[PDB]
Ligand binder design. Structure first.
Ligand SMILES: [Cl-]
Ligand SMILES: [Cl-]
Ligand SMILES: [Mg+2]
Lengths: 196, 241, 243, 250, 244, 222, 231, 4, 195, 204
């Protein structure tokens, strides 16, 4: 995997490749790693496919039950539920998750949860095996309060390089835009992003 | 006569604790009504706020169980909220286990089964509530399913519950004799709410202000309650016709 | 008959006489009130001075839950403490799992469901307290009152105990005369007056006043006790009104 | 807290009666009439659909229920008690038989399991007996067609034909005159409708009457093709229209 | 609490009797009569069905006589549902013994364990006793043919001939009169039917109101056979003795 | 094992080979790898044979009870959810690799499930030891908007690739077609391209060839 | 009447008779007095015997170096509650290296007694306790009732004829509160207080029981010839 | 096992 | 522990068990009786893990004696051997299994026949004319295959047994300090003192 | 220390025209040491036959377990269990011990009394049903048995001919396996008669 989430002026955008690996064989070349846990709270999944799916399903359940009683949960709340699962079961889990959401009060927020189950609130986050190759690029190119079009280009160029160098990353670049306007899905194919 | 204190049979094969739980239903002195449109299901209920010191916005007997399912209760609020919390938990668990939203009729059956257990097990008392579940089901369409303290449940074309329930029931019966159909032949949910309020006014014989009523509406993919101004807008439309 | 001898038994009316009997124990207790204000809530309570030997200011009845919720109650004092201990566990698990401090309506239902659970079985006794509680959260101020049955509602003002009717009447006048809203500092003063006026229904033993408050501006959204100059100022305001 | 009722609520009286079972049978007597008739090539079970209100949709309330593809059930007495028994009966057919033997249980053994559940409510702590009598019709390869009655006590009896509930005394007498050992399935359906008209007072049509059969295999109701041995369910619920067709030639 | 509603099913009367056991026996006295007769070359089990209806399926029915294993059977008097609980436990117990020792369970050992279960319900648990009396008919290589009875108290005794259920007083007097030790199975069959015919509450004894079974060594050489009689076989044996 | 699944116009089709192996030895030359969960939801299984059969039967049983309880036809996502949560609980120790496919009121669906409990969605999928041979064919010939007869051809061709090129797969091709609005048709031994040729000689022995020490009649009766 | 069969039942007027009957067991108990100044806190207790051949029932129990109580009513119940206090004091020291506040001690006893008044099967505690202690906020005196109610006081008394000592302390309030840095005088005031509850009997050497805790004084009990000074 |  | 042998002849069963108990490089005892009487006509010899052997043997002994008192009756050798097998079969899948191998020699009074059963620690039961456990079989079995006849007398069985012990004393690496020999027949169990 | 090859042994089953045959060797050993030449591995419950290879203690235990279960089945069902049903019972019982299995290789054989159809089936140690028209093999010489059966077998053999085929399959397979042999038994099963024959084979 290569995954990232980036906050910007109007909200937050999540980004991911579509590769699932069993050894050197690509088990799925069109995987969806961007996952809904609530209307406008999504997550990027990396590590074990089984572990991250099981966690995401449990979080979705918790937030659905939260909403029935107390109304819409904050992005911080969603990240906390993820953390609780990842931290308490750290010995049995291989899950690197980035949580991203849009509030109207708090606007776009990004929380990254690495292997240990620690929580880190950041302006943007990168994770997965392919992220290693773009720490330099992302640090030099990220700006706060970018536009939608700029942020899309930033994620597109970043994951393009991650895919180029990481054998464990590839396929299409999926993205999910989270704003006041709603939820928009984007897809970008090899023929476009490879020749960037 | 301890057979009247717990849920065991009396000599004539009755369960008095269940029967007395039915009488607790009317303790609030509130009447509710539910009807179906083409695309929607509307439920209305009286809203009585006697104490001036009460915050009227917190006084409610209608509950949003899930995104798709709504529930109105006839009975005391403690038991009502007990039922509501359990329904919300059951609906959420169902979605997690089986991968799709719990249908209205399935939730009704589940809550009806829970009620049945209280009529058979001694240590648990029945809840003194009647639960009316509403939704626009993705398979069955507009749906009304009602549960009582005996553990009974059934689907309805329309229904009413409360002290003056019989007057409302016959009023609805006579309309469906005339219209010759199973629902309110109307496009918008707004006019279905208007129908519901109009026929409640006729049956009860009382006029309603914006604070005397409480309205819940179920459409495809969402159930929602109306604000006082939404109801006031609806009351103005009735008066101007 | 015999329907009133066991908890969780319906009478032929559809009533639970054991809960109604618990209400009598609440009516017997000292007066306690709650006033909702512009950006928060105020709590007050009557403390009967049984003897000179009671240490002043050192038998505190108002209790804090988490750091933003206050609770006061009338009736069997131990039952109230048991309810607050539960409330504190409920609030701790909420904050543990969801990070954010528990909202007031969420907290209200946690107590409500717990009290209601003590009307479901004959192996437990209903709570012998009505609990006035509330605080400040993300959506603003909330005031609640919870009764032995598990019934609770939101309130503009709330009262319970032996002088509840007197306190209610005085509360209704404040709601009528202040439609736009009452300030936090005003609500503290009014709370003192109402306790003093409600003391007329318990006037054999003289009493001690105790006030607390949560306000977005005045206390920064946290629960604090009113003490010192602000307490004496509120007492003096109350003393001037009775005469 | 906790269930302190660990003692029996059904006990023997000095006269040797088990009160709560007797009183449960009384509740069955008050219940709406239901019947079952066994033919040479099938079994029929029927009952009236007593509607609680005309606004209620009686289609949503099913008194006749499928337990396995070859076994059905109907009742008289308390509906809610029946509904949970059907749930438990469906599950026990899987847990204590199908998951072990890879096939559905024969009628007599499924009946035996339901009877066991009803007996335990007569002896276990802190529970009353079930206030229902069941009529369970079914078919299996080695026993053929069969019809069983199950009472609140947990006792069950095999019948050629019988009735339970409101007008069961008269309905049994009617069935004695009409029943013979050469009855074909269609003849048994005809007799079932005649017997039921006597106990029904109001409207008598396909919307107020609920009727199902255990008969020939139905490949069209199986939902798939390709396995020759799998030929479909023998249980079939008659439609509202199918009932009205037989009420004209009555 | 719940103390109020407790019947106290496991206590003594002032006279030293167990209320619930006595009342359970009273229940059993209204149940259909069941007779067991032990001969030198076999055992007979005969039982009267409770007031039969003409539309009852008679051939595929089992109310009174149940098989515990290949060598042991029981006749029931009381609540059938209660009996089936105990019967399944007895069947399992027999198989446990066979699994453990690779030998068929001796009759008494099976009877003692089943009776010990009944005893438990009279001393602890606060539950009602089983409203059931059994007649056990079986064979093993130690004592040969054996008849036993057990009742709700959990007390069991051995017999040459015995009745349970209704009209046991009248039935026992008649058995005591005509029984002798050198009796054969075919004679015992006749005695069993004659006794039921005189003690019955019905107008006349017929094939449809009876269950019948024998345990003989009438198989081929040194082995025991259980014969649960079919309806037609009861009809024939009833004619052969001249009752109908 | 080679198993595949292919979506088409008005439904979905799954297929499988019919060889089961213990080590290098062919235990069964015509086993059935296509399982029924519900009438219109079918499952293709690879990996540990006992696990695939047991997990498909358990979920199939619970799906039936669920269908009766809800008075609704069972959905593929329910079978998917129940399978994955069961498999995840056992941390891959239940070695069941499945392709789940079927039709329901919601529409036509195709999923795969791995032993650890991860699921995938797709228009074409392959699992088992011959999955690479099968996937090569699927990646070469698959297109959007396939007809029923085209999907069956593609599916069986993908299985054949496994049969010929993978030593773990062999014998015949089973197929099941699930189309919307119609009954699912199970096509047992849809192709049989590995028929054993006539033997050169009969090995029927003269009677009495085998030396015998003792004879005795066995009693099966009571 | 019909509502006193167990603690889980309320009367029609909202009373708990089993709790009130437990309260009655305290009234039958021998008198014990508690009082404090700003520097010290004192317990005085009249011990009771079965007859002249028997010993005198010990009324005072030590909980920690800085805390202890006196009892009136069922002595075994006091042993259970004191044992619980010893553990709670001890838990505070081992885990937090912190001496347990006397106020928290009271809160813990309240909550323990309360649970016995709301559940079926159990019974209320049949004993009243006077807890004294010296912590970070000075001297403290608490009164425990088995209803759950705990009260902080300058002085008090419980047991038979405790009203006499309670009236005396109410008069003497202004005097004894300012007995700072003088243990013997504070005890003298407590001995004079308990003397107002005596009838036909007087304070002897094996009858009187005194305990004290303060600023530079660990909780210690005086019996036998050590209390002859105060008669 | 499948990785991401 | 180590050497336990068994021979079933015409009218009796003969068990022979080594007397040595060795721990490390020291023979701690040279007169150890590795057997327990389960009932008047049933004898069990045993060998295996230290502690487990006696603990298991005495546990079985207690159970058979309990049965005898309860029913006032002696269990057949076949019945006892099945009970013993089941206990070992349970044991092998326990947290800590009994590592004990046994021979059961008994005389069935109802059949008037001697019976020898061999059961290993896994719960593997076989009825045999002659049996052994451990390395003993690797010498004795082939010797008994040759010299054993089914119609032998007790005296002939004892001579056949002497031949086995002599072979073991010649070719076995360890000194097992001779054997205790016990006979089981219609008259019960008795010990041969001079062997 | 491989549980399935400590004791040794083999079982084979075959179908013919209106008949079935099941056969097994008689050896029981402890690795190299032959211990018993009377250890039969085929059992029957009514008309249903079960052969079991593998760890001998589990062979005995499972026989006792299936006798237990088929006896209770008969008492409750009032009829003898059929091969198809019994096959499912064996499968369920083995899978119940999924993570602590009996180390066995069972083989079911029999004729359905209602339909008259010959039936055989095989299982792995954890319950996977292997149904077959022709033959099932199990044990330490399964490779040898697969080879013999695949070459010697033809469909629709008469009972007398089927006996020769299954006997020669077992014998020649056993003689290429160190842990199998020491005698053999063959069951020929017709609709309502069953013949059991002991074979003469080399005893090394
Ligand atoms: Cl994934
Ligand atoms: Cl349910
Ligand atoms: Mg050799």
């Amino acid at each position: 995997t290569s995954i990232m989430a980036v906050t910007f002026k109007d909200g937050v955008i999540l980004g991911a490749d579509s590769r699932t690996t069993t050894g050197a064989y690509i088990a799925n070349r069109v995987t969806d790693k961007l996952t809904r846990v609530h209307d406008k709270i999504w997550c990027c999944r990396s590590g074990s496919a089984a572990d991250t799916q099981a966690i995401a399903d449990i979080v979705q359940y918790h937030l659905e039950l939260y909403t029935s009683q107390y109304g819409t949960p904050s992005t911080e709340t969603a990240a906390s539920v993820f953390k609780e699962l990842c931290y308490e079961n750290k010995d049995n889990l291989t899950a690197g998750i980035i949580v991203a959401g849009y509030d109207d009060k708090n606007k776009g927020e990004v929380y990254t949860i690495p292997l240990g189950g620690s929580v880190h609130k950041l302006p943007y986050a990168i994770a997965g095996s392919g992220s290693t190759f773009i720490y330099g690029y992302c640090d030099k190119n990220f700006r706060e309060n970018m536009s939608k079009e700029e942020t899309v280009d930033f994620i597109k160029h970043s994951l393009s390089q991650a895919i180029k160098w990481d054998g464990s990353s590839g396929g299409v670049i999926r993205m999910v835009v989270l704003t006041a306007a709603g939820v928009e899905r984007l897809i970008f194919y090899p023929d476009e992003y490879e020749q960037l | 006569g301890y057979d009247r204190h717990i849920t065991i049979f009396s000599p004539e094969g009755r369960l008095y604790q269940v029967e007395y739980a039915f009488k607790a239903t009317n303790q609030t002195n509130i009447n509710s009504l539910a009807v179906r449109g083409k695309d929607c299901t509307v439920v209305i209920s009286q809203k009585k706020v006697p104490d001036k010191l009460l915050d009227p916005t917190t006084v409610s007997y209608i509950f949003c169980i899930s995104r798709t399912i709504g529930m109105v209760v006839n009975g005391p609020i403690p038991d009502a909220r007990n039922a509501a919390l359990r329904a919300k938990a059951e609906a959420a668990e169902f979605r997690y286990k089986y991968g799709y939203d719990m249908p209205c009729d399935v939730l009704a059956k589940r809550m009806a089964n829970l009620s049945q257990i209280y009529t058979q097990r001694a240590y648990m008392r029945p809840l003194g509530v009647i639960l009316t579940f509403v939704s626009v089901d993705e398979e069955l369409g507009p749906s009304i399913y009602k549960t009582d303290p005996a553990g009974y449940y059934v689907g309805y074309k329309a229904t009413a519950t409360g002290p003056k329930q019989q007057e409302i029931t016959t009023n609805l019966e006579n309309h469906f004799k005339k219209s010759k159909i199973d629902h309110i032949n109307e496009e918008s949910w707004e006019k279905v709410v208007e129908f519901a309020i109009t026929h409640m006014i006729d049956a009860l014989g009382t006029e309603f202000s914006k604070n005397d009523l409480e309205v819940g509406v179920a459409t495809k993919d969402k159930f929602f309650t109306l604000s006082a101004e939404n109801i006031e807008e609806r009351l103005v439309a009735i008066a101007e016709q | 008959t015999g329907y009133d001898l066991s908890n969780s038994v319906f009478s032929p009316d559809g009533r639970n006489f054991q809960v109604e009997y618990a209400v009598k124990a609440v009516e017997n207790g000292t007066t306690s009130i709650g006033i909702k204000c512009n950006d928060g809530v105020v709590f007050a309570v009557e403390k009967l001075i049984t003897s000179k030997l009671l240490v002043p200011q050192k038998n505190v009845k108002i209790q804090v839950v988490d750091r933003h919720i206050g609770c006061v109650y009338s009736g069997l004092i131990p039952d109230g403490r048991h309810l607050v201990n539960r409330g504190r566990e409920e609030a701790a698990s909420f904050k543990k799992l969801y990070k954010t401090p528990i909202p007031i309506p969420a907290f209200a239902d946690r107590l409500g469901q717990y009290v209601q659970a003590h009307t479901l079985y004959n192996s437990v006794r209903p709570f012998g307290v009505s609990t006035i509680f509330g605080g400040v959260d993300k959506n603003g101020a909330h005031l609640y009152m919870l009764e032995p049955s598990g019934s609770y509602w939101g309130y503009k003002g709330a009262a319970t105990g032996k002088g509840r009717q007197s306190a209610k009447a005085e509360l209704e006048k404040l709601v009528d005369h202040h439609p736009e809203g009452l300030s936090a500092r005003e609500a503290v003063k009014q709370a003192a007056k109402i306790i003093y006026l409600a003391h007329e229904d318990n006037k054999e033993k003289d009493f001690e006043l105790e006030i607390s408050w949560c306000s977005l501006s005045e206390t920064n959204g946290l629960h604090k006790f009113v003490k010192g100059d602000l307490l004496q100022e509120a007492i003096d305001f109350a003393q001037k009104e009775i005469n | 807290m906790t269930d302190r009722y660990s003692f029996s609520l059904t006990t023997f009286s000095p006269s040797g009666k088990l009160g709560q079972i007797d009183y449960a049978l009384t509740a069955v007597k008050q219940g709406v009439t239901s019947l079952g008739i066994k033919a040479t090539n099938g079994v029929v079970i029927a009952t009236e659909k007593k509607s609680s209100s005309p606004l209620a949709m009686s289609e949503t309330l099913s008194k006749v229920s499928l337990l396995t593809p070859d076994i059905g059930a109907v009742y008289s007495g308390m509906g809610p008690d029946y509904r949970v028994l059907v749930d438990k009966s469906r599950k026990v057919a899987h847990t204590s038989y199908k998951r072990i033997y890879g096939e559905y249980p024969p009628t007599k053994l499924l009946v035996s399991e339901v009877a066991k559940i009803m007996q335990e409510a007569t002896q276990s702590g802190g529970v009353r007996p079930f206030g229902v009598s069941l009529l369970i019709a079914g078919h299996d390869e080695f026993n053929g067609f069969s019809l069983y009655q199950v009472d609140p006590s947990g006792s069950y009896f095999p019948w050629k034909a019988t009735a339970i509930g409101k007008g069961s005394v008269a309905a049994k007498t009617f069935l004695e005159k009409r029943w013979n050992d050469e009855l074909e399935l269609e003849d048994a359906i005809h007799i079932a409708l005649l017997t039921l008209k006597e106990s029904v007072e109001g409207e008598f049509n396909g919307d107020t009457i609920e009727l199902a059969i255990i008969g020939d295999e139905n490949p069209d109701l199986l939902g798939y093709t390709g396995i020759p041995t799998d030929k479909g369910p023998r249980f079939r619920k008659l439609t509202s229209q199918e009932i009205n067709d037989r009420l004209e030639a009555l | 609490g719940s103390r109020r509603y407790d019947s106290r099913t496991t206590i003594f009367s002032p006279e030293g009797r167990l209320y619930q056991v006595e009342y359970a026996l009273e229940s059993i006295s209204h149940a259909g009569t069941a007779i067991g007769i032990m001969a030198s070359d076999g055992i007979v089990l005969a039982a009267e069905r409770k007031v039969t209806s003409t539309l009852l399926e008679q051939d595929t029915s089992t109310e009174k006589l149940y098989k515990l294993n290949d060598k042991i059977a029981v006749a029931v008097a009381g609540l059938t549902a209660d009996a089936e609980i105990l019967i399944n436990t007895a069947r399992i117990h027999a198989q446990n013994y066979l699994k453990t020792y690779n030998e068929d369970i001796p009759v008494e050992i099976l009877v003692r364990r089943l009776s010990d279960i009944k005893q438990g319900y009279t001393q602890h648990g606060g539950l009602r006793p089983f409203g059931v009396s059994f007649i056990y008919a079986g064979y093993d290589d130690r004592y040969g043919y054996q008849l036993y009875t057990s009742n709700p108290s959990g007390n069991y005794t051995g017999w040459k001939a015995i009745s349970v259920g209704a009209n046991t007083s009248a039935a026992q007097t008649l058995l005591q009169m005509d029984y002798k030790d050198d009796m054969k199975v075919d004679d015992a069959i006749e005695l069993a039917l004659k006794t039921l015919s005189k003690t019955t509450d019905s107008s006349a004894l017929t094939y449809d109101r009876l269950e019948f079974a024998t345990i003989r060594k009438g198989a081929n050489d040194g082995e025991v056979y259980q014969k649960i009689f079919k309806p037609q076989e009861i009809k024939d044996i009833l004619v052969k003795t001249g009752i109908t | 094992t080679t198993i595949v699944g292919v979506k088409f116009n008005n439904g979905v089709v799954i297929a499988a080979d019919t060889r089961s192996t213990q080590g290098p030895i062919v235990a069964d030359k015509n086993c059935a790898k296509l399982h029924r969960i519900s009438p219109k939801i079918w499952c293709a299984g690879a990996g540990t044979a006992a696990d695939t059969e047991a997990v498909t039967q358990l979920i199939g049983s619970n799906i039936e009870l669920h269908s009766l309880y809800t008075s609704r036809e069972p959905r593929v996502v329910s079978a998917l959810q129940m399978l994955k949560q069961h498999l995840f609980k056992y941390q891959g120790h239940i070695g069941a690799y499945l392709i789940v496919a079927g039709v329901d009121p919601t529409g036509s669906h195709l999923f795969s499930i791995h032993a650890h409990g991860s699921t995938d969605v797709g228009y074409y999928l392959s699992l088992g030891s011959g999955s690479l041979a099968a996937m090569a064919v699927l990646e070469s010939h698959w297109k959007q908007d396939l007809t029923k007869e085209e999907a069956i051809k593609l599916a069986s061709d993908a299985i054949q690739a496994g049969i010929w090129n993978d030593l773990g797969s062999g014998s015949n091709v089973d197929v099941c077609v699930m189309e919307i609005g119609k009954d699912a048709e199970y096509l047992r031994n849809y192709l049989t391209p590995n028929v054993r040729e006539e033997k050169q000689k009969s090995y029927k022995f003269p009677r009495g060839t085998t030396a015998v020490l003792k004879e005795s009649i066995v009693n099966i009766c009571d | 009447n019909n509502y006193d069969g167990d603690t889980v039942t309320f009367s029609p007027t909202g009373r708990l008779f089993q709790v009130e009957y437990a309260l009655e067991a305290i009234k039958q108990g021998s008198v014990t007095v508690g009082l404090r100044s700003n520097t010290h806190a004192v317990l005085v207790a009249l011990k009771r015997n079965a007859d002249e051949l028997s010993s005198y029932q010990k009324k005072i129990i030590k909980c920690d170096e800085h805390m202890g109580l006196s009892l009136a009513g069922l002595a075994p119940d006091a042993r259970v509650l004191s044992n619980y206090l010893r553990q709670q004091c001890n838990y505070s020291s081992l885990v937090f290296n912190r001496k347990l506040a006397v106020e928290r001690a009271g809160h813990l006893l309240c909550d323990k007694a309360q649970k016995n008044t709301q559940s079926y099967g159990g019974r209320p505690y049949g004993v009243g306790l006077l807890i004294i202690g010296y912590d970070k906020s000075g001297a403290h005196l608490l009164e425990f009732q088995p209803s759950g109610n705990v009260t902080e006081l300058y002085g008090t008394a419980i047991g038979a004829r405790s009203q006499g000592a309670k009236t005396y302390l109410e008069r003497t309030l202004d005097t004894f509160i300012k007995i700072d840095g003088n243990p013997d005088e504070l005890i003298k005031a407590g001995v004079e207080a308990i003397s107002q509850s005596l009838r036909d009997e007087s304070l002897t050497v094996d009858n009187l029981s005194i305990a004290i805790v303060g600023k530079d004084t660990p909780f210690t009990i005086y019996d036998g010839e050590a209390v002859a000074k105060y008669i | 096992a499948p990785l991401x | 522990m180590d050497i336990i042998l068994g021979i079933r002849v015409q009218d009796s069963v003969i068990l022979a068990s080594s007397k040595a108990v060795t721990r490390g490089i020291s023979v701690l005892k040279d007169s150890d009786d590795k057997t327990r009487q389960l009932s008047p006509h049933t004898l069990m010899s045993f060998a295996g893990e230290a502690g487990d052997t006696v603990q298991f043997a005495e546990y079985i002994q207690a159970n058979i004696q309990l049965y005898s008192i309860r029913e006032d009756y002696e269990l057949s050798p076949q019945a006892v051997s099945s009970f013993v097998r089941q206990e070992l079969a349970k044991s092998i899948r326990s947290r800590r299994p009994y590592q004990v191998n046994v021979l059961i020699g008994g005389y069935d009074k109802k059949k008037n026949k001697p019976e020898l059963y061999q059961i290993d620690y896994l719960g593997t039961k076989v009825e045999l004319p002659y049996g052994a456990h451990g390395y003993s079989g690797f010498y004795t079995f082939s010797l008994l295959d040759h010299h054993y006849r089914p119609d032998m007398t007790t005296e002939e069985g004892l001579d056949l047994l002497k031949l086995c012990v002599q072979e073991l004393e010649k070719r076995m690496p360890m000194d097992f300090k001779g054997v205790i020999v016990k006979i089981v027949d219609k008259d019960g169990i008795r010990q041969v003192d001079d062997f | 220390s491989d549980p399935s090859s400590i004791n040794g042994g083999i079982v084979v089953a075959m179908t013919g025209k209106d008949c079935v045959a099941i056969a097994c060797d008689l050896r029981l050993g402890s690795q190299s040491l032959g211990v018993s030449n009377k250890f039969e591995k085929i059992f029957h419950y009514g008309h249903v036959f079960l052969g079991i290879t593998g760890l001998a203690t589990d062979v005995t235990t499972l026989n006792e377990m299936f006798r237990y279960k088929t006896n209770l089945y008969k008492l409750k069902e009032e009829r003898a269990i059929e091969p198809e049903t019994f096959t499912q019972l064996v499968s369920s019982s083995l899978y119940e011990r999924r993570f602590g299995p009996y180390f066995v290789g069972p083989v079911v054989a029999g004729i359905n009394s209602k339909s008259g159809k010959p039936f055989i089936a095989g299982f792995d140690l954890i319950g996977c049903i292997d149904e077959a028209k022709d033959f099932i093999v199990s044990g330490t010489a399964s490779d040898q048995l697969f080879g013999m059966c695949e070459s010697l077998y033809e469909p629709n053999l008469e009972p007398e001919d089927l006996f020769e085929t299954i006997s020669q399959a077992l014998l020649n397979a056993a003689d290429r396996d160190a842990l199998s042999g020491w005698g053999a038994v063959v069951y020929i099963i017709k609709k309502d008669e069953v013949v059991k024959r002991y074979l003469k084979m080399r005893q090394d």
